[PDB]
Amino acid sequence: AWTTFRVGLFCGIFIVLNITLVLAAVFKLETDRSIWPLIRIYRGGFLLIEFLFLLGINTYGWRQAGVNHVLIFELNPRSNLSHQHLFEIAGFLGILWCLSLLACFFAPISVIPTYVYPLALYGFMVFFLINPTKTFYYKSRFWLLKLLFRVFTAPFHKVGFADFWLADQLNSLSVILMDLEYMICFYSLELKWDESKGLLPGVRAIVQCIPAWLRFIQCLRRYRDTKRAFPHLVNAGKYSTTFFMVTFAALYSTHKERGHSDTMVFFYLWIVFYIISSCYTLIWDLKMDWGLFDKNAGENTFLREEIVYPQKAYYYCAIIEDVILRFAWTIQISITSTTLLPHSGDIIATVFAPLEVFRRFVWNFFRLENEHLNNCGEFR
Amino acid sequence: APAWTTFRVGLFCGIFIVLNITLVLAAVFKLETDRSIWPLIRIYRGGFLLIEFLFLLGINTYGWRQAGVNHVLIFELNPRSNLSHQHLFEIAGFLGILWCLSLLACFFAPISVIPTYVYPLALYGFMVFFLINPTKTFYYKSRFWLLKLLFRVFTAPFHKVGFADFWLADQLNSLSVILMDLEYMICFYSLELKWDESKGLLPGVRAIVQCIPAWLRFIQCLRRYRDTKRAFPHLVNAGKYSTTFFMVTFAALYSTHKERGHSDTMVFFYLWIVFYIISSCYTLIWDLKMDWGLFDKNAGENTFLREEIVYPQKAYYYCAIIEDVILRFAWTIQISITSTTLLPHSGDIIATVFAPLEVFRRFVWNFFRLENEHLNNCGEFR
Numbered sequence A: 001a002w003t004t005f006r007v008g009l010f011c012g013i014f015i016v017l018n019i020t021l022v023l024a025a026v027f028k029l030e031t032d033r034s035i036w037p038l039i040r041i042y043r044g045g046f047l048l049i050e051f052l053f054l055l056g057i058n059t060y061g062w063r064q065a066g067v068n069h070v071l072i073f074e075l076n077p078r079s080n081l082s083h084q085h086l087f088e089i090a091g092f093l094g095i096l097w098c099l100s101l102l103a104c105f106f107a108p109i110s111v112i113p114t115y116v117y118p119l120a121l122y123g124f125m126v127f128f129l130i131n132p133t134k135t136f137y138y139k140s141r142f143w144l145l146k147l148l149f150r151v152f153t154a155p156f157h158k159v160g161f162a163d164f165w166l167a168d169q170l171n172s173l174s175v176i177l178m179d180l181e182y183m184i185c186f187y188s189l190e191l192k193w194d195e196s197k198g199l200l201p202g203v204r205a206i207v208q209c210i211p212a213w214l215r216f217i218q219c220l221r222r223y224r225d226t227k228r229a230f231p232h233l234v235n236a237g238k239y240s241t242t243f244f245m246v247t248f249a250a251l252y253s254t255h256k257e258r259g260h261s262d263t264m265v266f267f268y269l270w271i272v273f274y275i276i277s278s279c280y281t282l283i284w285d286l287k288m289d290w291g292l293f294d295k296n297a298g299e300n301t302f303l304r305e306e307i308v309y310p311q312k313a314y315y316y317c318a319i320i321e322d323v324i325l326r327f328a329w330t331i332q333i334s335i336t337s338t339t340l341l342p343h344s345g346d347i348i349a350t351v352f353a354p355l356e357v358f359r360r361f362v363w364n365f366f367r368l369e370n371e372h373l374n375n376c377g378e379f380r
Numbered sequence B: 001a002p003a004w005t006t007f008r009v010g011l012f013c014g015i016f017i018v019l020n021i022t023l024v025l026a027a028v029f030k031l032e033t034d035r036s037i038w039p040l041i042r043i044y045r046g047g048f049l050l051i052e053f054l055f056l057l058g059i060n061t062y063g064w065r066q067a068g069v070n071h072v073l074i075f076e077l078n079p080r081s082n083l084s085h086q087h088l089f090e091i092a093g094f095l096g097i098l099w100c101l102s103l104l105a106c107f108f109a110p111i112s113v114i115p116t117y118v119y120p121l122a123l124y125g126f127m128v129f130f131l132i133n134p135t136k137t138f139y140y141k142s143r144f145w146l147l148k149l150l151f152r153v154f155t156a157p158f159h160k161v162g163f164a165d166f167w168l169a170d171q172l173n174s175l176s177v178i179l180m181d182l183e184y185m186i187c188f189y190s191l192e193l194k195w196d197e198s199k200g201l202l203p204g205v206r207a208i209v210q211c212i213p214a215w216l217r218f219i220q221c222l223r224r225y226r227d228t229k230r231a232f233p234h235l236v237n238a239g240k241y242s243t244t245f246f247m248v249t250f251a252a253l254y255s256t257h258k259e260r261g262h263s264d265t266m267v268f269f270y271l272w273i274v275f276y277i278i279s280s281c282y283t284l285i286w287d288l289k290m291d292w293g294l295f296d297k298n299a300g301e302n303t304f305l306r307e308e309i310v311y312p313q314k315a316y317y318y319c320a321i322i323e324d325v326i327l328r329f330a331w332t333i334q335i336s337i338t339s340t341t342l343l344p345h346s347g348d349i350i351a352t353v354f355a356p357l358e359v360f361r362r363f364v365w366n367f368f369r370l371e372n373e374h375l376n377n378c379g380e381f382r
């Protein structure tokens, strides 16, 4: 009863803080002040909060549909997180995010420099996750930290379902890692450390391939430990396509900045590998992840035989939104990896990144359902 | 325990909290030293006190339900659809959200064409319309029951006195200040203001109006004595309530004889202060001995208490006793100050500070009155 009350409290403190944020942005902002670094820094936090909210909705749908998402994840049958707790955590982090944004927008609050407010938020999140005091969701935080350890260094780690799931979720949430690297550079060699104005009126390729690299080496490991080349080397190639696409984007940008003559051939390679990568991940999503387009569909054409969710319109809406937002994700991870689009730049990424988490939230239902009804991942 | 009701209660509580923080941070920053905000607090105090009373009554319902004091057979309520404390929290949060929105609109004046004197009127109109909403929605049963109870309270001599009307008439004593503010509104919209300006403010009969709760309490226990012929509790109860009449009349006469020179102000001051002492002592001893039932014989381990308590800690009872003794004098001094013109130097500060404290004192008193009506028939009902 108190958890539901806290969910309601946070959902509404966050609402009024959002209204205040909109009013301050349309009123308090001093016209030309180069807001872009601020929104780029806070985009990671906003994406994390949205991902937590969408994952709460995911747990809600999983519980209603009758799936054993506490068994596939190998979670304990008791003392796991329901949708209420995820909503509460999301609301608390959103409250902190809004308070930090309002403090940044309101300089006359104190004489303390504004640029400390972002870290005080993000560091808090780390301090929230690094909580050895066994106070707040200690089992959940311990499980998450163990998963992060077994994911971020996972050549020498047998891959269970949770490892693969978080590794896949990293690709769609990689905007946070990109923004982290950008803010590290911004604090290193952009701001002056003297003026109290945080607005300030090829590594990128590696960092963006990092989630792809983790899932690549995790599927290579799965093949090594299983000997089934088809279900795993295919995914290895799927993320190799991401490697090639990011590499060709970087080469194209470098050669265009240098005025290199042969940059058009690099553009052609980039576009062909973009088509290849997008189609590859899309066909894997539809055919293997969700398990749709099964030849034994019958009356459930374009879907599979066994359907758990009530309405079939959800599946078709998801198919269309997937075939659109997967192209969106590929174009976004190609643009933000380099200086591909100087004009749009952060605008298209800021529009698409929130949608990549939505696409992954939608994909979570069907991946969990496909793995539940028939053990698609071979995790047994 | 419905999840959606608790979510809405938390939502309204959070909105109310953030709006109160914004009000505190705005009245300090977005106000002007040339303004006179007193006719604004003197208007919104009724709504704020009503919202606080609803919140405290939700807490009281929580306490009664978790303590075993079934306020469904000793409150004349149907034991099939009873307003839970969560619903009281929800209503209080909704009214508080409306209160904060109207207050913020008055502070900022978002619309230029709308002058800053309709927002309090809009808030109070919305509250009364919610109370008198003809259609069957938004706790229609509870609102109809409350309307009928208010009807039979304000016409107490013509109705048999049950417990519900007795209790509502008791609660009106500490809500009497609200009516006083209403009277001020009646003057403020008829004597002050220019009906076209948009600002706070440019740089009696209410003495009789701080009697209607006391009047209804005095007429009750006399309508009861008419049918029961039990003078022992009822006549002294009526005398206790008439101490209020004497105190208010003498405060008014002292104010009238002090505002102009008549050479007998000291006599009125002496008689008013002795009436103050006797009324405060009368009410205090009635609450401690008759209403709460404390200081009863066979105390045993529970010294100064009854032989059978309900609440887990006797520390609660002792704090209640001390709180009543140090707030029943504040209640009387607030009655003296508001009903007349005693201290123009401070004036409204004392009333606006003591009124929420008096509502809190009622909140405490409700815990033990129903307890002593369940472990007894205190009030002589059954």
Ligand SMILES: CCCCCCCCCCCCCCCCCC(=O)OC[C@H](COP(=O)([O-])OCC[N+](C)(C)C)OC(=O)CCCCCCCCCCCCCCCCC
Residues within 6 Å of the ligand: A048, A055, A059, A073, A074, A075, A076, A078, A079, A080, A081, A089, A122, A123, A125, A126, A128, A129, A137, A139, A140, A141, A142, A143, A144, A176, A180
């Ligand atoms: C290196 C840079 C950062 C990279 C990582 C960024 C954070 C990624 C974390 C997101 C995923 C968390 C939820 C996934 C699993 C939940 C699914 C589920 O149902 O599982 C139930 C689990 C727990 O289930 P449980 O509670 O029933 O436990 C199971 C029982 N045992 C343990 C006994 C088996 O849910 C969780 O683990 C969620 C709780 C944590 C949610 C996030 C809180 C902290 C948020 C801040 C993270 C750090 C931000 C850093 C930003 C930058 C800083 C510089």
Ligand SMILES: CCCCCCCCCCCCCCCCCC(=O)OC[C@H](COP(=O)([O-])OCC[N+](C)(C)C)OC(=O)CCCCCCCCCCCCCCCCC
Residues within 6 Å of the ligand: A004, A007, A010, A011, A014, A049, A050, A053, A057, A060, A083, A084, A087, A090, A091, A094, B003, B004, B007
């Ligand atoms: C009047 C509403 C007008 C439309 C508003 C639209 C606003 C935008 C869309 C919001 C959609 C909300 C969907 C929530 C999930 C469905 C509700 C649900 O689970 O109810 C059951 C639960 C109750 O659980 P329950 O007990 O019903 O559990 C189900 C079990 N059975 C079926 C057996 C009863 O409702 C709740 O009280 C919890 C969820 C309510 C919504 C919580 C929102 C929290 C937000 C915190 C901040 C988020 C920050 C990031 C947000 C994104 C960026 C802005």
Ligand SMILES: CCCCCCCCCCCCCCCCCC(=O)OC[C@H](COP(=O)([O-])OCC[N+](C)(C)C)OC(=O)CCCCCCCCCCCCCCCCC
Residues within 6 Å of the ligand: A001, A002, A005, B001, B006, B009, B012, B013, B016, B051, B052, B055, B059, B062, B089, B092, B093, B096
């Ligand atoms: C950290 C606390 C102190 C700082 C915050 C101050 C908050 C206000 C002062 C304390 C409130 C008293 C305790 C909470 C209310 C009692 C109910 C409770 O705890 O029961 C547990 C209940 C659940 O109890 P339950 O019915 O499940 O019973 C538990 C026992 N079983 C399950 C076995 C039957 O939790 C809630 O859902 C509480 C929700 C309400 C919380 C209070 C805030 C409401 C605000 C509404 C607006 C008020 C407007 C007026 C403003 C103030 C006056 C000017």
Ligand SMILES: CCCCCCCCCCCCCCCCCC(=O)OC[C@H](COP(=O)([O-])OCC[N+](C)(C)C)OC(=O)CCCCCCCCCCCCCCCCC
Residues within 6 Å of the ligand: B050, B054, B057, B061, B071, B075, B076, B077, B078, B081, B082, B083, B091, B124, B127, B128, B130, B131, B139, B141, B142, B143, B145, B146, B175, B179
């Ligand atoms: C001049 C204005 C005078 C105003 C005087 C004060 C008015 C407000 C009174 C509040 C107390 C009422 C609740 C008592 C509840 C105690 C018993 C209990 O717990 O039972 C639950 C009770 C009974 O609810 P129930 O649902 O159990 O109903 C009983 C069931 N039946 C009917 C089948 C028998 O709950 C209520 O009575 C709640 C009523 C709804 C909340 C109303 C809030 C106030 C609305 C505005 C008031 C007017 C504002 C001023 C207008 C001025 C205009 C100029």
